[PDB]
Amino acid sequence: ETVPVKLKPGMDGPKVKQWPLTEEKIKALVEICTEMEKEGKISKIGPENPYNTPVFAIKKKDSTKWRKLVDFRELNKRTQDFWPHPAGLKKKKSVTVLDVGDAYFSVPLDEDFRKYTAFTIPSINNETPGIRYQYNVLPQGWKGSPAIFQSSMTKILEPFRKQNPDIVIYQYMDDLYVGSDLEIGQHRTKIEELRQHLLRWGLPPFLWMGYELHPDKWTVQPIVLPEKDSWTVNDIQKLVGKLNWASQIYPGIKVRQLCKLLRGTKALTEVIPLTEEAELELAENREILKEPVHGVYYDPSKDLIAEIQKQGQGQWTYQIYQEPFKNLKTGKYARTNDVKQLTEAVQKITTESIVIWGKTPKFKLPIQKETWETWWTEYWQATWIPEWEFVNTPPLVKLWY
Amino acid sequence: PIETVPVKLKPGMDGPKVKQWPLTEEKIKALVEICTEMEKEGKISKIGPENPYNTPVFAIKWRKLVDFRELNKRTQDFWEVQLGIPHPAGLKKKKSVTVLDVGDAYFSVPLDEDFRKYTAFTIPSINNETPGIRYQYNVLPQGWKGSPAIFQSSMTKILEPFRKQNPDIVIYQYMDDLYVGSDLEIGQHRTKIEELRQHLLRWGLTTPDKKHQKEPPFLWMGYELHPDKWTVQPIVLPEKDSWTVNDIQKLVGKLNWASQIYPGIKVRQLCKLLRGTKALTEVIPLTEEAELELAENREILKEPVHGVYYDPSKDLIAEIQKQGQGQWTYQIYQEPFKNLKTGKYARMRGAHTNDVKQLTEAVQKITTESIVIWGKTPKFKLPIQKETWETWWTEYWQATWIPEWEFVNTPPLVKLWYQLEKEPIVGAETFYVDAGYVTNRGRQKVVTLTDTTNQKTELQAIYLALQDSGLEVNIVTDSQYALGIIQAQPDQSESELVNQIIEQLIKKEKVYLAWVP
Ligand SMILES: CCCc1c(SC2CCCCC2)c2cc(Cl)ccc2[nH]c1=O
């Protein structure tokens, strides 16, 4: 029996374009889809289907096996809502991530919706029509699948849940976050127990290297000020600028005394001794910055935004906020090439957004689209895909982090 | 026969109920003849008063043309054709290549029974008091929205088997043209063809006879296609005395087309003729440099150069040169300096930039192009040194990445004509700018700028500063704008101001630029 699903009222199906893939990826995609065809998971479609979703081939961590990744971003957006997050999970010591996508492959998709799951394996230099298909079963990556498989899912989990209540389990799209605080040795073993307990029902790889996220250790990178021996006119000016900026967040920041040191068109390199007044003013500014601005609460009904700044030498800076300057979180990331790092970053950041709020953020990437579109699939490993847009990182925002 | 593709009208719409224009009895007579035959053939079938739908028909020896615009407006969208043509370099050499004309293919394919009713038209009767014959299609209507897609699709299914049965062959569909390439012996190749025509025929699919088939070379959408090589249809440059904006615009067009195969084509000088132009018919006299370019190009064109096909076996090598400020020339080849394709890149991304950035962008275009044509990225050979690249790289806010590339010492070598000092300069005077500046050493200059804009005054100040300052300068400004611009170390710009500054910068020994609120 198939649960009748519908697109939000009025909304038609997606007709997204397919970005040019590399022969190798096309091959992977063909090998895969042909087997999924044999297994009745998908079926070829005709020209009467004008819709299309982009597919991609990514690489599994610790496997020679490729993974088909469908960008149902647009579809999920035109897909009706369905009618929660364990705030405790973010507190666990170890969160391991499992890919339970194959779960869905054993559940038919409402015949009428199938047409919307249309996708295409492009062909090189347009020498052939391209291979068109649509799903018959629940498709991995579609927001719908988790929902519909929700029931059949809770069943499967209720035993372990009661058997190991010291363990928190969260499902998101094709991912399942298993958390605890047990000794690493134990954590890993109990995990494996779940794997086999999942097999007991039916077709689960370790996402993220089968390694553990340690959310407990996640911490907010506060703003920091240059602590130096001697202070030159330039140092001060930079200092003041930075403070001035930070002021809009922490309005308790005073510069009056530091600016006084800067009276008179002096020489950048001239060393300026600080008056005790300013000395104390700085000290206060420093303490004020020691922690995030109070009053920043997460709104479940607002989009989670995530901007990244390139700092150079394998170093990057990010911030998760819903309202400008009202950062719910900020962090750093160190190494690879710009792109690899960058993707690795986005994925780290996303995973957290999920773990913490259960929602993927919407990134603002410091890169040229054509570029990203070209290499991202080369390092991407998650099963989901965040919403993203490309931008131009302002010179100063970078200097302030 | 082939499996029917189910069609439907657009949601919430109804079949075409359009009235049939009046028809000349001479045209009525011609239609009936045509329709009878079609019916005798099964393509259409007389229907009854049941069907209230109708689509206009008119006469154009006599021919039949039905206006499907309205039906098409009411017909669902299809995944369509492809509007993605292969580029000759993407192809591989072949010993023989024959092309058959799938004569009236659409009429050879059935039509979703449930849809047939919407194709209903009417041949008016000659005399007043009498009724006019009503029909509907059983096959793909010529001019109908579906037809193309549905026809191709079915074609492919029909070809699918034979395709896997005959691996030693390849086929390309394009409208009603079927190209068959092979590396078989003419005889074998020529028979396999016949082996194919039968398979088609097995589905009543007819194709021209060898006696009337088309063999290479092929003049396809701006191309000339030989089994072993390709090029662009020959290009003849005029020799006018009087050149019109229009003539020039076109020339520039044709010239670009060449670009992909003919290296060194240059259109700068000509393109310059279009400045200020008030009419498409306006005549513009050629410059001394425009005449030079035209003539240079004329010569490059006099040489028949050709492209080579893709040899999946060999790697792809891409080579890029700076042809002019902003201009970059490249050629992708597999075998030593024997191109599959070549090309240019003038794309200036942003009001200001530097060769490093601009060269890096050229790389991304080529990379995309390659993937689209050969499914793979080529190994690049660039006139830049890793150290140079790496330096600009790590120091630029935007993330970037260049595939696999080898430095090729082929002048000119892209470089960084200057680098801002990371730390302020001791011993170097200090300027505080805003239209004027003041230095730690007492000096000051104010200037009245006319017409300028807020931002353009900020760069002027700075310019002013650089000018008057000695070899080593420290500059403080509040304009975040100018700071970004200069921090970005551009070496070329559409704005002259910016260029003057850039000049200053190059000449300096050390320059430190700082910002303050
Ligand atoms: C049918 C396979 C495509 C193919 C062609 S057909 C080519 C298809 C586009 C329309 C024009 C003709 C081809 C033609 C020539 Cl003339 C030489 C090499 C070639 N190598 C190939 O792989």
Short mmCIF file of C-alpha atoms in Angstrom, two decimals, chain A residues 15-17 19-24 44-52 112 115 120 123-130 132 232-235 237-238 240-242 244 262 264-269 309-314 316 335-342 365-372 374-375 379 391-396 398-400, chain B residues 5-8 76-92 149-150 152-153 156 160 163 171-173 310 347 349 357 361 364 367-368 371-377 392-403 423-428 430 432 438-441 474-476 480 483-484 487 512 514-517:
data_model
loop_
_atom_site.label_atom_id
_atom_site.label_comp_id
_atom_site.label_asym_id
_atom_site.label_seq_id
_atom_site.Cartn_x
_atom_site.Cartn_y
_atom_site.Cartn_z
CA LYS A 15 12.42 20.91 -13.85
CA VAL A 16 15.97 21.44 -12.63
CA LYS A 17 18.85 21.31 -15.03
CA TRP A 19 25.09 19.91 -14.36
CA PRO A 20 27.72 18.41 -16.74
CA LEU A 21 29.22 15.24 -15.23
CA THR A 22 32.59 13.55 -15.86
CA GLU A 23 32.55 10.36 -17.90
CA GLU A 24 33.71 8.37 -14.85
CA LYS A 44 12.98 4.13 -17.40
CA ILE A 45 10.69 6.97 -18.37
CA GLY A 46 9.40 8.43 -21.61
CA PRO A 47 9.16 11.99 -22.97
CA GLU A 48 5.82 12.52 -21.35
CA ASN A 49 7.77 13.34 -18.18
CA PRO A 50 8.95 16.96 -18.47
CA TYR A 51 10.38 17.04 -14.90
CA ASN A 52 13.95 16.51 -13.73
CA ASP A 112 1.16 9.33 -8.91
CA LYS A 115 6.70 11.23 -12.12
CA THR A 120 18.71 12.00 -15.94
CA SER A 123 25.65 11.75 -21.85
CA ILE A 124 28.94 13.17 -23.03
CA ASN A 125 29.02 15.83 -25.62
CA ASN A 126 25.29 15.29 -26.14
CA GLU A 127 25.99 12.34 -28.39
CA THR A 128 23.00 10.46 -26.92
CA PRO A 129 19.54 11.36 -25.50
CA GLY A 130 20.54 10.80 -21.92
CA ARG A 132 15.87 9.08 -17.94
CA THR A 232 52.25 51.08 17.65
CA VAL A 233 49.87 53.63 16.07
CA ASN A 234 48.90 51.04 13.45
CA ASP A 235 48.24 48.29 16.01
CA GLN A 237 44.12 51.81 14.76
CA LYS A 238 43.45 48.22 13.83
CA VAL A 240 40.06 50.44 17.41
CA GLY A 241 38.58 49.52 14.07
CA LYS A 242 37.96 45.93 15.20
CA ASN A 244 34.36 49.64 16.79
CA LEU A 262 45.31 58.39 18.22
CA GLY A 264 47.51 63.85 15.83
CA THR A 265 48.53 62.62 12.41
CA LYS A 266 51.33 60.41 13.69
CA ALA A 267 53.41 57.79 11.95
CA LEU A 268 51.99 54.33 11.62
CA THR A 269 55.09 52.76 13.10
CA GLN A 309 35.45 33.17 5.42
CA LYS A 310 38.70 32.11 3.86
CA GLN A 311 41.53 32.86 6.28
CA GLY A 312 44.31 31.28 4.25
CA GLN A 313 46.81 28.55 5.11
CA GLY A 314 44.06 25.94 5.41
CA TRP A 316 38.49 29.07 7.66
CA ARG A 335 42.89 21.39 6.92
CA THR A 336 43.88 19.52 0.40
CA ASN A 337 43.05 22.58 -1.72
CA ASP A 338 40.66 25.48 -1.20
CA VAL A 339 37.66 23.58 -2.51
CA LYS A 340 38.21 20.30 -0.66
CA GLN A 341 38.69 22.13 2.61
CA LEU A 342 35.68 24.28 1.90
CA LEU A 365 30.10 30.43 -0.09
CA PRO A 366 33.23 32.56 -0.86
CA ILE A 367 33.66 30.99 -4.33
CA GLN A 368 32.70 31.20 -8.03
CA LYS A 369 29.73 28.96 -8.83
CA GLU A 370 31.20 27.29 -11.95
CA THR A 371 34.09 26.21 -9.78
CA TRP A 372 32.11 24.83 -6.93
CA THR A 374 32.81 21.45 -10.77
CA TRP A 375 34.67 20.04 -7.79
CA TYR A 379 35.01 15.57 -1.94
CA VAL A 391 29.19 35.52 -2.37
CA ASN A 392 32.07 38.05 -2.11
CA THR A 393 33.74 38.04 1.35
CA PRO A 394 34.35 41.67 2.48
CA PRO A 395 38.07 42.39 3.26
CA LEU A 396 37.33 43.55 6.79
CA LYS A 398 37.81 38.44 7.55
CA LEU A 399 40.26 40.62 9.49
CA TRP A 400 37.79 40.68 12.39
CA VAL B 5 3.48 7.31 -25.30
CA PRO B 6 0.52 8.56 -23.21
CA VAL B 7 -0.23 12.25 -23.74
CA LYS B 8 -2.52 14.63 -21.84
CA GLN B 76 1.50 19.20 -22.06
CA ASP B 77 5.22 19.99 -21.96
CA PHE B 78 7.48 17.11 -22.87
CA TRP B 79 11.03 16.34 -21.83
CA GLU B 80 12.34 17.65 -25.08
CA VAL B 81 14.71 17.20 -28.02
CA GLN B 82 18.11 18.12 -26.58
CA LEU B 83 19.20 21.62 -27.72
CA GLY B 84 22.59 20.28 -26.72
CA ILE B 85 24.59 19.57 -29.82
CA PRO B 86 27.85 17.61 -29.79
CA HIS B 87 30.91 19.64 -30.73
CA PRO B 88 33.05 18.00 -33.41
CA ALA B 89 36.12 17.80 -31.17
CA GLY B 90 34.03 15.60 -28.92
CA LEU B 91 33.78 12.99 -31.70
CA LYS B 92 36.19 10.18 -32.61
CA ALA B 149 10.26 14.19 -28.54
CA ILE B 150 7.97 11.17 -28.92
CA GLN B 152 13.05 10.53 -30.96
CA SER B 153 12.23 8.51 -27.88
CA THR B 156 15.91 5.24 -29.51
CA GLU B 160 18.45 0.23 -28.55
CA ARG B 163 22.77 -0.92 -30.93
CA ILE B 171 24.64 6.05 -34.17
CA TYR B 172 23.55 9.63 -33.73
CA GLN B 173 20.01 10.88 -34.01
CA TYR B 310 38.97 12.79 -29.88
CA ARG B 347 35.88 37.48 -20.12
CA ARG B 349 34.95 39.26 -14.44
CA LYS B 357 42.78 35.88 -11.44
CA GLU B 361 39.10 32.01 -14.67
CA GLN B 364 37.60 27.19 -15.20
CA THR B 367 37.55 22.93 -17.55
CA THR B 368 33.82 23.19 -17.97
CA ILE B 371 33.90 18.14 -19.29
CA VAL B 372 31.01 18.99 -21.58
CA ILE B 373 32.84 17.68 -24.67
CA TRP B 374 35.21 14.92 -23.59
CA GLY B 375 33.86 14.00 -20.22
CA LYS B 376 37.23 14.75 -18.66
CA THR B 377 39.50 17.57 -17.50
CA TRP B 392 48.21 35.04 -4.92
CA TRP B 393 46.15 31.99 -4.06
CA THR B 394 46.63 31.76 -0.32
CA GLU B 395 46.33 35.55 -0.06
CA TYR B 396 42.92 35.97 -1.78
CA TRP B 397 39.67 35.78 0.24
CA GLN B 398 37.82 33.78 -2.42
CA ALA B 399 38.44 30.04 -2.50
CA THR B 400 39.84 28.63 -5.72
CA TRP B 401 41.44 25.53 -7.27
CA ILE B 402 43.25 24.68 -10.50
CA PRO B 403 43.36 21.06 -11.74
CA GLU B 423 53.14 45.49 7.88
CA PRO B 424 53.45 49.30 7.86
CA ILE B 425 56.80 50.75 6.76
CA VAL B 426 59.21 52.31 9.26
CA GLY B 427 61.05 55.27 7.77
CA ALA B 428 58.39 55.65 5.12
CA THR B 430 52.62 58.47 6.39
CA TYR B 432 46.10 60.25 5.83
CA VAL B 438 47.90 65.09 5.35
CA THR B 439 51.19 63.51 6.29
CA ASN B 440 52.97 62.88 9.57
CA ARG B 441 55.67 65.10 8.07
CA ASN B 474 52.25 54.28 4.21
CA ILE B 475 48.67 55.16 3.39
CA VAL B 476 45.68 55.34 5.70
CA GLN B 480 36.65 50.39 2.67
CA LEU B 483 40.85 49.37 0.17
CA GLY B 484 39.14 46.28 -1.18
CA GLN B 487 43.93 44.99 -1.52
CA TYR B 512 51.31 49.76 3.03
CA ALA B 514 45.58 50.59 5.98
CA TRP B 515 41.98 51.32 6.79
CA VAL B 516 40.35 53.17 9.69
CA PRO B 517 36.74 54.32 10.41
#
